[PDB]
Design a protein around this nucleic acid. Sequence first.
DNA 1: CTGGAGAATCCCGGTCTGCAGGCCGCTCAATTGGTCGTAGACAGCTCTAGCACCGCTTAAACGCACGTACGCGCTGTCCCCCGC
Lengths: 99, 93, 93, 81, 79, 107, 107
Amino acid sequence: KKPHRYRPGTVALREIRRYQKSTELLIRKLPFQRLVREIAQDFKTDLRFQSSAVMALQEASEAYLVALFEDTNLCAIHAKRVTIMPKDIQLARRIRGER
Amino acid sequence: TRKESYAIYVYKVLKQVHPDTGISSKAMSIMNSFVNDVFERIAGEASRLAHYNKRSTITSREIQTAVRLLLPGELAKHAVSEGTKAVTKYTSA
Amino acid sequence: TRKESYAIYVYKVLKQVHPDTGISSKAMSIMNSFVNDVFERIAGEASRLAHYNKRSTITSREIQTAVRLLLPGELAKHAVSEGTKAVTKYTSA
Amino acid sequence: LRDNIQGITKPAIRRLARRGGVKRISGLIYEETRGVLKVFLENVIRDAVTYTEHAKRKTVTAMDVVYALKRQGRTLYGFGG
Amino acid sequence: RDNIQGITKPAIRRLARRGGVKRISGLIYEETRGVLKVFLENVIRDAVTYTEHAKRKTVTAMDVVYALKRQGRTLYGFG
Amino acid sequence: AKAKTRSSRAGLQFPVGRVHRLLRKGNYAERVGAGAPVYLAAVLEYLTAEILELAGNAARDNKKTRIIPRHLQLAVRNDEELNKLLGRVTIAQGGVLPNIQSVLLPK
Amino acid sequence: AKAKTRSSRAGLQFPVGRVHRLLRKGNYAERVGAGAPVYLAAVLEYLTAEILELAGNAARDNKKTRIIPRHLQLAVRNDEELNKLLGRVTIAQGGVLPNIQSVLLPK
DNA sequence: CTGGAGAATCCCGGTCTGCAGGCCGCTCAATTGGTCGTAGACAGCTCTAGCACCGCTTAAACGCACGTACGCGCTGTCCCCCGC
């Protein structure tokens, strides 16, 4: 009569393995399209969009985010830590040249 | 032979903004390098744009778009204003 | 209208090296884009080489130089060998 | 169109980090991720709209996105070429 | 022949100081030597390529300028 | 005599004539040399052969008869020189290399 | 009639004729618009004036009558938009901005 | 060490289906042949700078003594992120 729960972290490793083998998008399509159109609203009104364009933005953004996450993980590990801190992201972006 | 540069024009611009400030040779060499760099960047972007729209002519609109793409914010706005004013003045003249 | 691509030649090469291997449309487009990008890189580098040397022609020597500049090590050497072999064969025949 | 950046839910960023090889994640990360993503999207969309307008068009094509990504040093294959 | 040892530790320390570095480990110097060597190969290879394509035997500064430019490191003040 | 394609003359799979046309239409120079398009076509063909060979090896390793973007990404990233060449390229639906840092492994 | 410079007609200091000639010989497009070199020269002149003003300010702050590469570097790095524009540009003998991290300061 | 237990994953048939690839008609872009103009290949000339050498001079690198603070290991606390 025990809940039989897994230890903290093994599930994280399992999902890391799961998501490092797949290739599909990880973000819901409709919210991403809504955000993209909202951002584009500030540059020109009544703008129409090809669907292939929105897929292109989604792919590029997810790839860039994965790269940034990988760099941030290295930065945090350099601090002998296991959890990711925003300071790691800031340092990584600064080193990349984005800051 | 003779090699052309931007020394005289940069000198005149300097005398317009700072009518008393001198300049060294290394500085104006850097000036000419910077001018050439910007020229090549804008011209290449304009050529890319013209090829993008299947057109054989490079007009001032292409340069305006290229400047908007290459310069950040306020610099782009001010440069657009300068180019528009110069074009209008030359056409009127 | 009609758009052209490198699809047939890519499929030919695929059958040459892996005669029993198919390919999806998306991957096929990926190779098409890759070939286009490499074409642009080599062409731009060759154009810069010609302009630097004040030349009117893009010859195979410029192509070889651009290949050396843009390719890493063994890729560059093998590509140079392949290009020289193809040029020799075409010249002879 | 207001309050869409909240559309990127915490599980989505979690999945993104898991694909990024991240095992333990702080709770005060997600808003930073959203801000950075917003900056990147703004930077790309600005140039994409510039390209679309220079062509005197009213719809944004994927090919415009391709040019915008290329000019920012992030080349993407498989979207027209 | 060990010109890589021509890069003495005072010069490395000076460069670190201009870089705003206060405390330096002893293992740093050889690491800098290696990284600088790698950078030098990367630049010089392209420089020699340009010199050869021009069918010349003397490397010009403009060759170095082009090599740096094509590597994403633009340099001014030399042409 | 009957027309003989320059690709066949040089024994290549890629269209040398189309390459020459693109070279002339790219505003790259005033005039285009005779052998340059052949050289470029040969180089493109060789690189295509390299990437296709690696992708086919990967797809067979995954035990599929068609090459998908995942196999392309695996082939490009696993090769040192190909990854070096395509260092700044994003492959749609390419996924990531299954790499995990050692420190996060359960000990 | 007497020759009048196109720069004077546009009220510019940058040589519009030289710009147009370089555009023609730069292999950018088959045809060049008449209003193109004027626009390009105007943009170049504006940017030159901006950075020259900043460099003159820096040189005056150093009580020097001539702008040196150090002044140019200081002006470029201090101006946010200018620094972003020349992000990957290295200036010879420009030095670096004097900046020291807080944690290294004595406490 | 070490069986059980439970959850997670793999695998092997069995079924369906969209597209990969082959086939076909056509057409326009590649080809062939001939003209002509001119870019650069080539030989030749000049003289600049790049290489080498030598002798002083002295600032900088080097070696070393010495001392201290900091990177690192260790420990206890709590809170906050993960598994559900």
